[PDB]
Amino acid sequence: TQAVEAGEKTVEQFVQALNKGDYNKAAEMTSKKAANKSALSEKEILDKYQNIYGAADVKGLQISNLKVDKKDDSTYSFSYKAKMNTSLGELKDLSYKGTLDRNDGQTTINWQPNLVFPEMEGNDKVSLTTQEAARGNIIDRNGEPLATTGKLKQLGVVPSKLGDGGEKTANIKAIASSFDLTEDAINQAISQSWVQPDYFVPLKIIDGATPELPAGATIQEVDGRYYPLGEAAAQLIGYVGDITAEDIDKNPELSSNGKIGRSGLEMAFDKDLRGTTGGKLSITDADGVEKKVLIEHEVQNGKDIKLTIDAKAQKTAFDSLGGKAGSTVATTPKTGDLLALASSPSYDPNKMTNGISQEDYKAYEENPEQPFISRFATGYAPGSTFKMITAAIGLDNGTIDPNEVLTINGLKWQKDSSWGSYQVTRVSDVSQVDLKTALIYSDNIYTAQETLKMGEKKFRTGLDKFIFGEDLDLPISMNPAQISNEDSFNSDILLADTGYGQGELLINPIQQAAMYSVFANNGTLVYPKLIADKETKDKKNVIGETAVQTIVPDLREVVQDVNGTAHSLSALGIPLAAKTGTAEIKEKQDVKGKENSFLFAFNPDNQGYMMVSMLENKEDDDSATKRASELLQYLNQNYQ
């Protein structure tokens, strides 16, 4: 029985060597070649496993229900059940039998071809036929396509039908001029090592209409992934790339010929979009006639995915950022439907998924404004926009009297002399400041004093009723918002800065839209939703109804009052409640610090839409309010 345990260890080591993919190690655990022992030599067994398991992309061999008993003086029968993963899914309940040979002081496996698959005889062969699945679509709330499989017009040249050294340069310059292509790049393409004279060398995809084709140029129809909105949704949707051998080694169910999601929703929803590969894995006779079918299922095309996104709102929100750094979130605040998630600047996902030059890709990566960032999912200090949450907290716990008038003299203020050189700063020298005045002029000193008056304990008590620390049920990679680094401020200065949205606060635009939805639901926080069919989830009694009915009229005055910080939006003539902000950021990079512009706005009459826009590292005389007119007009018209 001390040898039965040795045979157990031998079978375990053999299964492990197969599982780890080291077929040489597994083959060396077999006895010598014979008719009573192993059916093949070690190198023959290695090539058999390598060829067959590699053809089926076998990964993760796991055994169970093992039993091994003595059969003769040196024979030891073993048996187990096996499960393994292939290109067509899981092979479950595989019954493996065999024999072991004990000799001298070592136990080896009398190898037989039934140790590759249970029903394999002498020189049986394995066949695998597969049908690739079509990738599902991503569509907006009205069925318009955001990511589909289209028929693209590929442009290319045949170097043989181009010229003979003289007319070649003429046709190269003609094809380079008539298609906005660098004339040096065309020759760089027809001079790669893989090119041959009679070959078709692709260059670029033609977006729509096909110009006149000079000599050598030809248009071939090629089907592939297509993104209609382009850069306007590139961060959200993402792109797909060719599947590599390493992708297959990680997940065998990928079609070693299809496309895999590399970023955004295409990657987050890769499983539901790529479908399931159909086909048949069968054992055949040595002549080629089928013996038994191990696996067989038919193709399952990927299912479509419908988003809450509005395509027209998405394109308008993106275009309004003029290619500058920033982002925009538009929701229906009563349900959380994310109408638009724009981030700028952006990259071309169509030229990214087809053929992207490595200098173009390095330009995207080295761009200081970083077009690959999903800015709607990046944490920022919310700026002066955060006042209206602090004020709502101050109204709930009774610290703030909406009509009590603080007397503020100057543009700088500090609690006492212990603050040193630091002082809270406002832009407008208004002497008599109450709550409505503070929201209209965006007065930091009023907010800082009221925050210090209510104290850290009451402040954090009101803040904890929001979504700080929560992970929203969204297929977008993001970090949870935070009030500060630790659970305590341990600083009056940091407490005041957090009071007007400027401390260690980190809230991304989507989390901002969720927190600010309280003013459109009488203090109920409505979680944002991106998938159209999901049910609305909310969180009641975050702030009081009295605080909403007090602040929202003041937010109307931020627009309508002649000195309100959002008064330019009065030109729209639509019911608006807004709040602006300008956060100062110390970014060690160049001359002094930069600043971000923020705008929050929603319809206070019907609560039909809500918008949060930002400009990151803004230019002088630039702001989010300056650019919000078009998106606000659209949302006001189409979302009552």
Ligand SMILES: *C(=O)[C@@H](NC(=O)Cc1ccccc1)[C@@H]1N[C@@H](C(=O)O)C(C)(C)S1
């Ligand atoms: C809120 O964020 C406030 N911003 C500051 O106090 C810092 C600052 C930075 C640059 C210029 C001026 C002030 C106020 N909110 C914005 C705004 O609503 O646009 C103001 C510029 C009114 S300050």
